[PDB]
Design a protein around this ligand. Structure first.
Ligand SMILES: NS(=O)(=O)c1cc(C(=O)O)c(NCc2ccco2)cc1Cl
Ligand SMILES: NS(=O)(=O)c1cc(C(=O)O)c(NCc2ccco2)cc1Cl
Lengths: 355, 357
């Protein structure tokens, strides 16, 4: 009170010192940019992202305020004061970062390219899964997926937390493809927080039916390199199998409102809808990506079968080339992958290795 | 040591400590981002902006990088490492913050909107004068003035400085407009440094013929509030008078290439070329703003005669409504106000630094 200048000067001096360093490859140091609507909303997501980003990296709770430009400054100021007070009340090492933008994409770009000083710049983007995508306008879903792809453009690592907001054995990990160390680094950082200390990492991977021993040995060596006391590596070959009849029926029902039946409908009408409504899922997309959808459905049913009784499932996030797949189908894949499981955490880190 | 995590986490906890303090509104401090593309170019500008930001605020030497997205990140990181090494080589406490944008205005918007974290966020926009704007495409000058107007829109202070790139004692302060005190805060911070100890702040005012004592005591008490310790407080009544004809014709010659003499030329051609080049200066603009231009020229004359020798000249910055003046006319005003002087530092601030430092 009246002598905060000392704190400010100390912070500035330490930040300059930190910027003094020159080597970044050695330490990945996960810095998270959490894109939640407001810190008060989605408290569970905030706690879970804070768990693995606390004393091991900062977290910037971003907020893209959008509205009339005239009174934007006063609204943003009152919001910053209120949300910072709330966010310190529920002790969190998180910085509230509000910006003004005409839409979520622009504000996300502001936060993703400008937030932070020197070395304290976010390098992963954390999004809560858009649970209301079915009832939401599909333009906003397109914007959500385009935000994923913008993150992948700036060499960010995308984390998607799907968590049941209506609210002690193991922490399953479903490492499938390389990414980096991030997918395996999130469980390591989770385990050392004294809240998940009594939780045991039960890694999973896919492999050939004639190579369980060799794959297990190699993955155990990698885990020892990551030194996360892996309990066991349940190498599976069940991937790439027709899931079931009921599961495929459920997925078809999910995507039915957005499917485009070009063959059933007249070609001119199909083109008209595509031009005036480009997020419609064409049948060509389904035919091309039928194996990928089978992979998603099979992975979901495997998660239910093996990892039902797990606290935090960590899985690798499916991705597709920008524009190669309709946004509606992409969110359908994300819905199917994480359907009725415990708090699940889809991760795709950047190519550069964490350590 | 070869480890940095100790510094990183300590800096974190300090930043969280800072953000936790309920500073209310009584924590104004000059936090400026120096929008200059190449920190190697214009070292004098960085040194000057560093003099009054050494230990009272941060300096985010922003930089917008233009090019293809593919290899944008690689060269951006290369430049970041290079320029941070350069800044550390010199004794500058500046964070080199680069962003990628299609145009300078968009990257500047990124920086001004989202740069910084917590309460160590930028507060003013230091802008090196766009010297050689005569030879530069006028789209560039349009963006340059739009930067001023964006900064004013987002409640930022704007300071533009016209250092000579080639690089008794007194610091002149022309407190002409009440902008919240930043014009007076910059000189105070300058003086309280090893270089400007022999400061001798000399303060000038603009007032009509009246009792000099009134304004004299007014600025005496104002500077006592600001702890300026003036060497002299002067009031000038020559402002807002017709300047010499030579300067007027010189100014008219400066804007001659960009002027739209629509009254002299045929109306259809004038309208067509106005539509082709919306930055052209119409004659109606000059007629409306003849008094403003005369003030801008008389002020340059006045500070040339009164303040020919002075290490720093800190003046209130001219402002115009968004779009009322063509960018060429605004830039011509700024160029005529600081035509041939020592380091001149035109300042304007959001009306919030009310004895708050
Ligand atoms: N998780 S989400 O896609 O549904 C989401 C949702 C929101 C959201 O709109 O709450 C958001 N912030 C934008 C905003 C505008 C006004 C207040 O916050 C960000 C995200 Cl990622
Ligand atoms: N001080 S300035 O207006 O002349 C200026 C100057 C520059 C600059 O060009 O150095 C700049 N950014 C870098 C850049 C890249 C391409 C065009 O500009 C930004 C600004 Cl504000």
């Amino acid at each position: 009170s009246s002598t905060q200048a000392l704190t400010y000067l100390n912070a500035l001096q330490h930040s300059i010192r930190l910027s003094g360093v020159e080597d970044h490859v050695k330490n990945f140091r996960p810095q998270c940019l959490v894109m939640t609507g407001a810190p008060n909303s989605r408290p569970a997501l905030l706690h879970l992202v804070h768990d693995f980003t606390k004393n091991v990296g900062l977290m910037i709770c971003g907020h893209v305020h959008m509205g009339p430009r005239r009174q934007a400054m006063k609204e943003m100021s009152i919001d910053q004061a209120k949300y910072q007070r709330w966010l310190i009340k529920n002790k969190m090492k998180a910085f509230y970062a509000p910006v003004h933008a005409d839409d979520l994409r622009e504000g996300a770009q502001y936060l993703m390219q400008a937030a932070g000083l020197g070395r304290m710049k976010p390098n992963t983007l954390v999004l809560g899964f858009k649970k209301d995508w079915l009832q939401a306008d599909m333009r906003d879903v397109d914007m959500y997926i385009n935000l994923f792809h913008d993150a992948f453009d700036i060499q960010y690592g995308v984390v998607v937390i799907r968590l049941k907001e209506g609210l002690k054995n193991t922490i399953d990990v479903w490492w499938l493809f390389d990414d980096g160390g991030l997918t395996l680094l999130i469980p390591y950082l989770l385990t050392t927080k004294k809240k998940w200390k009594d939780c045991k990492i039960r890694v999973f991977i896919g492999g050939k039916i004639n190579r369980i021993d060799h794959d297990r040995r190699a993955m155990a060596t990698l885990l020892s390199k990551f030194r996360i006391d892996f309990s066991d590596i349940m190498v599976l070959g069940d991937i790439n199998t027709k899931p079931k009849k009921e599961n495929i029926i459920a997925f078809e029902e999910i995507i039915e409102p957005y499917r485009l039946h070009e063959d059933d409908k007249e070609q001119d009408i199909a083109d008209k809808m595509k031009e005036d409504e480009p997020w419609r899922i064409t049948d060509n997309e389904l035919e091309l990506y039928k194996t990928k959808t089978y992979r998603q459905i099979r992975l979901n049913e495997l998660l239910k079968e093996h990892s039902s009784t797990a606290n935090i499932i960590v899985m690798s996030l499916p991705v597709a080339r920008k524009g190669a797949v309709s946004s509606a189908l992409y969110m359908a894949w994300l819905e199917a992958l994480s359907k009725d499981l415990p708090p699940i955490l889809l991760v795709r880190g950047n190519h550069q290795s964490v350590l």
